[PDB]
Structure formats: structure tokens, C-alpha cells
Amino acid sequence: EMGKDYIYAVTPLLEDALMDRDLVHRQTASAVVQHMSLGVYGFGCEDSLNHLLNYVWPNVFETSPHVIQAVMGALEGLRVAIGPCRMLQYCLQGLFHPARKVRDVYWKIYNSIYIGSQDALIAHYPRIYNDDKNTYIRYELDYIL
């Protein structure tokens, strides 16, 4: 938790390292992001960590095992630090993409976010409308007192 005063100082180095041709650079930088985000939790560095999440996310389309394993761990640490709401907002883009590869990756990320913090997601799901045959609106949440 002492590392909460030093995230802004390190973010430019990590921005350079997460956009780099060498795979080991990106793997180690994702390790750094994971340990930073888990080390500061409940102290309010959501701004810095949101900025870094913007640079971590482009690496989810990675074929290399150790790199994708580092990126998933960074994403699970950022879940704890930032909230399942922001992660769900990033993930809702490609759950029903036409491309089966995009769908594979996004459902992996969503299944992580779902197994961790399943009950917090009740408040963050988006509104989906009724079609001809099926009812998809949640009405109790629309009740007003």
C-alpha cells in the first residue's frame, strides 16, 4: 500500500513498455500492473489505474501463452482495484461480435469477471428490451416508491 504515491511517476514507463515489439516487455509490464493494482485497493487510485487499463486491454488478442497469462492476471487485479462495472463495460463490446475469435476472447474475460463478483453484477447489467416472444426487462428495479 506504500506504492499508492508512486503510480503516476511510473505510468509513462509502463505505457512505453506495454506498446513494444518484445513480448517479454509486455509480459513483465502486465505483471507490474497486476501487483500495483492489488497493492493499492481501497485507497482511491482509480484514475491512474483506468488510464493504465486503456493500455493493458489491446493485448488481450495475444497468441502467446505466457503473455496472455500475464495479461489475464493483470485484468483480474484491475477488477479488484477498479470495479466489475468498468470491466463489464469494456467486455460488453464483443460478446456477440460476428467474429468467433473475438467472441472466444471476450467470453474468457467475461467468465473471469463472472466467477469473481457474481453478485455485484446484478447492479451493472445493461437494459435489454422485449422482443416479440420474450420478456427481457427487469421491472422490480423500475419500481418507484
Residues within the interface to other proteins (CB under 8 A): 35, 38, 41-42, 44, 46, 76-77, 80-83, 85, 116-120, 122-124, 126-127, 135, 137, 139-145
Instruction: In whole angstroms, give the CA distance from residue 117 to residue 29.
Output: 25
Instruction: In whole angstroms, give the CA distance from residue 42 to residue 82.
Output: 9
Q: Tell me the closest approach of the beta carbon of residue 63 to other proteins, in angstroms.
A: 20
Closest CB to other proteins among 24 and 137? 137
Q: What is the DSSP string of 27-78?
A: HHHHHHHHHHHHHS-SS--HHHHHHHHHHHGGGGS---HHHHHHHHHHHHHH
Q: Tell me the closest approach of the beta carbon of residue 112 to other proteins, in angstroms.
A: 10
Q: Tell me the closest approach of the beta carbon of residue 82 to other proteins, in angstroms.
A: 7
Instruction: In whole angstroms, give the CA distance from residue 144 to residue 53.
Output: 36
Q: Tell me the closest approach of the beta carbon of residue 103 to other proteins, in angstroms.
A: 22
